[PDB]
Design an enzyme around this catalytic site. Structure first.
Site, short mmCIF file in Angstrom:
data_model
loop_
_atom_site.label_atom_id
_atom_site.label_comp_id
_atom_site.label_asym_id
_atom_site.label_seq_id
_atom_site.Cartn_x
_atom_site.Cartn_y
_atom_site.Cartn_z
N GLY A 181 0.84 -1.18 0.00
CA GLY A 181 0.00 0.00 0.00
C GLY A 181 0.87 1.24 0.00
O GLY A 181 2.10 1.14 0.01
N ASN A 182 0.23 2.40 -0.07
CA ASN A 182 0.93 3.68 0.05
C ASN A 182 0.24 4.58 1.08
O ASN A 182 -0.80 4.23 1.66
CB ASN A 182 1.06 4.35 -1.32
CG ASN A 182 -0.26 4.55 -2.01
OD1 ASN A 182 -1.15 5.22 -1.49
ND2 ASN A 182 -0.40 3.95 -3.19
#
Ligand SMILES: Nc1ccn([C@@H]2O[C@H](COP(=O)(O)OP(=O)(O)OP(=O)(O)O)[C@@H](O)[C@H]2O)c(=O)n1
Ligand SMILES: Nc1ccn([C@@H]2O[C@H](COP(=O)(O)OP(=O)(O)OP(=O)(O)O)[C@@H](O)[C@H]2O)c(=O)n1
Ligand SMILES: O=C(O)C(=O)c1cn(-c2ccc(O)c(O)c2)c2ccc(-c3cccc(O)c3)cc12
Ligand SMILES: [Ca+2]
Ligand SMILES: [Ca+2]
Lengths: 212, 229
Positions: free
Chosen positions: A27-28
């Site tokens: 994810g970010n």
């Protein structure tokens, strides 16, 4: 205060998550707040808004906005493709993952081998040029850019605009940012609240639709 | 009553994110809400609670709880090392990443043109197990109860209870909270694999209900262990 009446607008927001297995993922740190703000302002000015949302900071669904929730970059792509035919504005505000694990584990668990995800923004840009999105009037991209050893921030931003081919590239200089138009226009985006910067972004969209 | 009065409690909650670069990370889907619920309940019942929180930014801080914020599994490790000498009970409710990328890029990893490399992983330390070893070596004289959490399924090599008993025996903690799961919402299936397994052999069911009700049962389980000692 209601110039976008009759506009069908499709907005992507948040970051995508590329599963490693049922629980783990890549994810970010994207909040999605600026994409939601463009969605909220678009709806406030009369647009029929669809919001494709990945991972966000606890954000509440904007009122009057059709919500479509997604997990991965590929689910974003299919969501964009499914909602594409009637849309007049595409605002690609999501941080779409460039890579995903090649293998997704079936159970709870070496190295993770990666494979590239499709560039949805460029897919939309190409589809419109080959005649498959005649209703699409504005394709908007986002970029978070910075200066480094290979160029200053604005050089990188221009090159990104040129490479993507979208009508507008909203640039966040990681305090002020930029709005780069495909006709060469560049406006500074002053730092303010998420709503006011969204107004400047939507103002630019409305300005592009009228020129065309 | 207020059975946890005078108890110093150190609680970890949420998942950790293992950076690939400033923007990307390896993460899990843990909300952190069940860990907050145990802390709030501990605090409500008189404990002096310190809460080490992972990826829980939109959660509200429990009232009366000292907050410590961390990002990665390693920062969780260092926070636990710092705050463990003050605790009487360690409640390891966090979803700790088992592995971390071997190299962290100084900049965002650009999408180039050649084949994308692979992510090299390196195991993170077992923080709960580090605590169990420290207490055994005399470095945690105040530590009275070490509590772990686990999500356990039934695969091809045993049911939930097999894998859970093996985990408790292996971790060496005093109590293992198994499958404290779900928000009990409509259309959410209950598999009834909820358990509180003590290191003395007792096995009590953990019913699946609200976050608060499972938190109450867990703290009940803690208080019963403190009384045994
Ligand atoms: N697979 C992708 C990745 C990008 N985006 C969109 O493309 C735009 C540009 O994002 P950016 O990450 O800056 O472009 P990249 O080519 O991935 O630039 P870089 O490789 O430097 O990260 C954004 O609007 C984003 O939502 C997309 O539609 N599909
Ligand atoms: N590196 C780790 C792994 C987990 N935990 C803690 O130890 C307990 C065990 O979690 P679990 O993932 O089920 O144990 P693992 O040994 O990692 O088992 P598995 O490999 O099957 O996931 C949890 O309380 C968790 O907070 C920890 O302290 N540090
Ligand atoms: O919506 C959000 O806030 C959000 O999460 C964002 C995610 N990206 C994003 C896109 C591609 C990427 O490759 C990447 O790493 C990140 C953004 C890029 C720019 C802006 C922006 C624009 C003008 C003013 C401003 O303040 C912020 C916001 C975001
Ligand atoms: Ca990118
Ligand atoms: Ca694990």
């Amino acid at each position: 205060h209601h110039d976008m009446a009759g506009v069908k607008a499709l907005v992507t927001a948040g970051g995508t998550r590329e599963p490693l297995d049922p629980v783990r993922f890549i994810g970010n740190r994207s909040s999605g707040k600026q994409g939601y703000a463009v969605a909220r302002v678009l709806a406030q000015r009369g647009a029929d808004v669809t919001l494709i949302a990945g991972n966000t900071a606890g954000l509440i669904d904007p009122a009057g906005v059709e919500m479509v929730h997604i997990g991965s970059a590929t689910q974003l792509r299919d969501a964009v493709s499914k909602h594409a035919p009637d849309a007049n504005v595409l605002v690609m505000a999501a941080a779409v993952a460039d890579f995903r694990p090649a293998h997704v584990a079936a159970a709870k668990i070496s190295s993770i081998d990666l494979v590239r995800n499709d560039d949805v923004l460029a897919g939309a840009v190409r589809a419109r040029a080959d005649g498959q999105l005649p209703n699409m009037r504005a394709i908007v991209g986002f970029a978070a850019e910075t200066g480094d050893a290979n160029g200053d921030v604005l050089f990188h931003a221009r090159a990104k605009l040129e490479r993507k081919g979208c009508d507008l590239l909203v640039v966040n200089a990681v305090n002020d940012g930029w709005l780069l138009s495909a006709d060469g226009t560049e406006s500074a985006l002053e730092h303010g609240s998420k709503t006011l910067m969204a107004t400047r972004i939507v103002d630019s969209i409305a300005a592009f639709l009228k020129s065309q």
